[PDB]
Amino acid sequence: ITGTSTVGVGRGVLGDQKNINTTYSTYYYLQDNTRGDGIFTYDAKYRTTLPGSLWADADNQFFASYDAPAVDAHYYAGVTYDYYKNVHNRLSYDGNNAAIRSSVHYSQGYNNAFWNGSEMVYGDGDGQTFIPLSGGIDVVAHELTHAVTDYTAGLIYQNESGAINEAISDIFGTLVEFYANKNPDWEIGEDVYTPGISGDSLRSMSDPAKYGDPDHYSKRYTGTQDNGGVHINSGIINKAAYLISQGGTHYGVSVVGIGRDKLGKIFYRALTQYLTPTSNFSQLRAAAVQSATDLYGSTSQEVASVKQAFDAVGVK
């Protein structure tokens, strides 16, 4: 909507207060004009029609329970936009400042979130498995990263290419979480998963096998569930990424960590310059070796650690 740029205040799903960029024209809208062509957050109103209504508010204060998921979808989209722009000089998902749209209150008791090819969509959870899924900066960033992958590598959502697609989303979800720096970790979805159980999460990057995901190529899933296991076999790549950043010895193979920034640079470069729609894990390893060679040189520690991390997870 055409209007003037304002600044509202609200509370997110985890009860924290934050400022949101809004747009005023009779009502105050969840339209952030300060980032690219805009960040727009919508109310799906417990239905499944998308995007639903551009979120409107009478007074620019967003402290109602109903408001909280919209607040976090809006705010965390902004944080993720800032990560891509400040850290990787990428302007929105398409690199040309595309508008970023999100819908909250999607369906009733919907325990999930997704990128639908055009926008982010967030369930409220049923209240036991999940609370509103936009509550998780790692979740928001995971979903927006699917948009980045769409416009870049274009990794097909099935089998190895699909597990790469997933891992990139978990990788950058986590690196966004670290960038925002509120109790960040190498787990996925902890802020919104199982409110009655502490310390669990949906997936683990540091130890995928904690939730039954493989941490070695030998353990890859080859059935048909989950599009050939895209959220399962992502464990192999997430563990490689974790190793590259943090270091560690995994089935006897020792990896010297090179830190998060370098992880991010290497996988961003691979994503945007070397991966293709049909890339497999072996192709990821080479892309990641080339990206590191490009950035740090053939004989660098960074290249050596990329290779160690892929050896450790059984990917040659």
Q: Residues annotated as binding site for Zn(2+)? A: 142, 146, 166
Adjacent-strand bridge partners of 110: none
| Nearest-approach distance from CB 19 to Ca ion, in angstroms | 14
The token duo for 81 is 């936009």
194 binds, among Ca ion, Cl ion, Zn ion, none (CB under 5 to 8 A by kind): Ca ion
57 forms part of the interface with Ca ion (CB under 5 A):
yes
- The residue (of 183 and 299) whose beta carbon lies closer to Ca ion is 183
C-alpha to C-alpha distance for 106 and 52, rounded to whole angstroms: 9
- The residue (of 169 and 233) whose beta carbon lies closer to Zn ion is 169
Q: Applying CB under 5 A, which part among 48-56, 164-172, 220-228, 269-277 lies near Zn ion?
A: 164-172
289 forms part of the interface with Cl ion (CB under 5 A):
yes
User: Annotated catalytic, 302?
Assistant: no
145 forms part of the interface with Zn ion (CB under 5 A):
no
Residue 199, amino acid? G
59 forms part of the interface with Ca ion (CB under 5 A):
yes
Q: Out of 5, 7, 16, 48, point to the residue binding Cl ion (CB under 5 A).
A: 16
Q: In sequence order, which residues have a C-beta less than 8 Å from that of residue 299 and are 6 or more positions away?
A: none
What stretches of 200-296 adopt beta strand conformation (E)?
A: 203-204, 248-250, 253-255
212 forms part of the interface with Cl ion (CB under 5 A):
yes
Q: Strands 4-11 and 61-62: what pairing?
A: parallel
85 forms part of the interface with Cl ion (CB under 5 A):
no
Q: Report how many residues bind Zn ion under the rule CB under 5 A.
A: 1
Adjacent-strand bridge partners of 250: 253
User: Annotated catalytic, 231?
Assistant: yes
Residues 111-140 that bind Ca ion (CB under 5 A): 138
C-alpha to C-alpha distance for 10 and 19, rounded to whole angstroms: 6
193 binds, among Ca ion, Zn ion, Cl ion, none (CB under 5 to 8 A by kind): Ca ion
Q: How far is CA 152 from CA 206, 268, 281, in A?
A: 26, 10, 17
The helix (run of H) or strand (run of E) holding residue 252 is none
Q: Out of 97, 107, 129, 194, point to the residue binding Ca ion (CB under 5 A).
A: 194
Are the C-beta atoms of 41 and 77 separated by less than 8 Å? yes
The token duo for 300 is 């660098």
Q: In sequence order, which residues have a C-beta less than 8 Å from that of residue 298 and are 6 or more positions away?
A: none
Q: Out of 40, 130, 193, 310, point to the residue binding Ca ion (CB under 5 A).
A: 193
51 prior amide bond cis, ω within 30:
yes
43 forms part of the interface with Ca ion (CB under 5 A):
no
The token duo for 122 is 């967030």
Chain residues binding Cl ion by CB under 5 A are 12, 14, 16, 180, 212, 225-226, 259-261, 289, 307
Chain residues binding Zn ion by CB under 5 A are 169
Chain residues binding Ca ion by CB under 5 A are 57, 59, 61, 138, 177, 185, 187, 193-194, 197, 200
Active site residues: 143, 231
